[PDB]
Amino acid sequence: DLKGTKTAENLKQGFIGESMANRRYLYFAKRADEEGYPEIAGLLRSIAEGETAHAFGHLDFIRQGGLTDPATDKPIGTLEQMIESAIAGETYEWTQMYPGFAKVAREEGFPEVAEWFETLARAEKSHAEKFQNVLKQLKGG
């Protein structure tokens, strides 16, 4: 059983890093796009597909091992559990995380960052509601 092992923690950290790598490389590719480096941009995009495969493989072992979602500590074995994990994370983000980030940005004197965090709190609330509707569809049959 993977539960409680260092390998379980390493799969989680692997997933975090691969997730960031895909985002980072696609963001970098947009800079190459604008500056006129299509071969560099294309390489960044192709490497990013590698990082997708790596992240998804980590999630495969996590799920096969009975481990929980790195982002929420909720099970992700079935589709319903996956949607329940999405709801749990989104609910935390709109009710707690992004409002708290916005308050801190305001208190530190960064009103534009605070406004961004408030936009994201509203967006994650919308995401949460959409996922809640998906769960009603699945559990209702």
Coil vs helix vs strand at 42? helix
Cα-based torsion angle of the residue sequence 111, 113, 118, 120 in order, rounded to the nearest 10 degrees = 170
127, 135, 138, 139: residue in contact with Fe ion (rule CB under 5 A): 127
By residue count, the chain amounts to 141
Q: Which of these segments, 5-13, 30-38, 71-79, 116-124, binds Fe ion (CB under 5 A)?
A: 116-124
- Whether 85 contacts 137, CB under 8 Å: no
Say which DSSP state 41 is in.
H
According to the binding rule CB under 5 A, does residue 39 interact with Cl ion?
Answer: yes
Q: Could you give the CA distance from residue 48 to residue 19 in angstroms, rounded to a whole number? A: 10
Number of residues that bind Cl ion (CB under 5 A): 3
51 is in an annotated binding site: yes
Instruction: Map the footprint of Cl ion across residues 79-138, applying CB under 5 A.
Output: none
Coil vs helix vs strand at 68? strand
Coil vs helix vs strand at 98? helix
- Whether 120 contacts 98, CB under 8 Å: yes
User: Shortest Cβ distance from residue 34 to Cl ion (Å)?
Assistant: 12
According to the binding rule CB under 5 A, does residue 12 interact with Fe ion?
Answer: no
39 is in an annotated binding site: no
The residues binding its own copies (CB under 8 A) are 2, 5-7, 10-11, 14-28, 30-32, 35, 37, 40, 43-44, 47, 50, 52, 54-57, 59, 61, 65, 69-71, 76, 79, 82-83, 85-86, 89, 93, 97-98, 101, 104-105, 108, 110, 113, 116-117, 120, 123, 127, 130-131, 134, 137-138
Which stretches of the chain bind Fe ion, using CB under 5 A? Answer: 124, 127
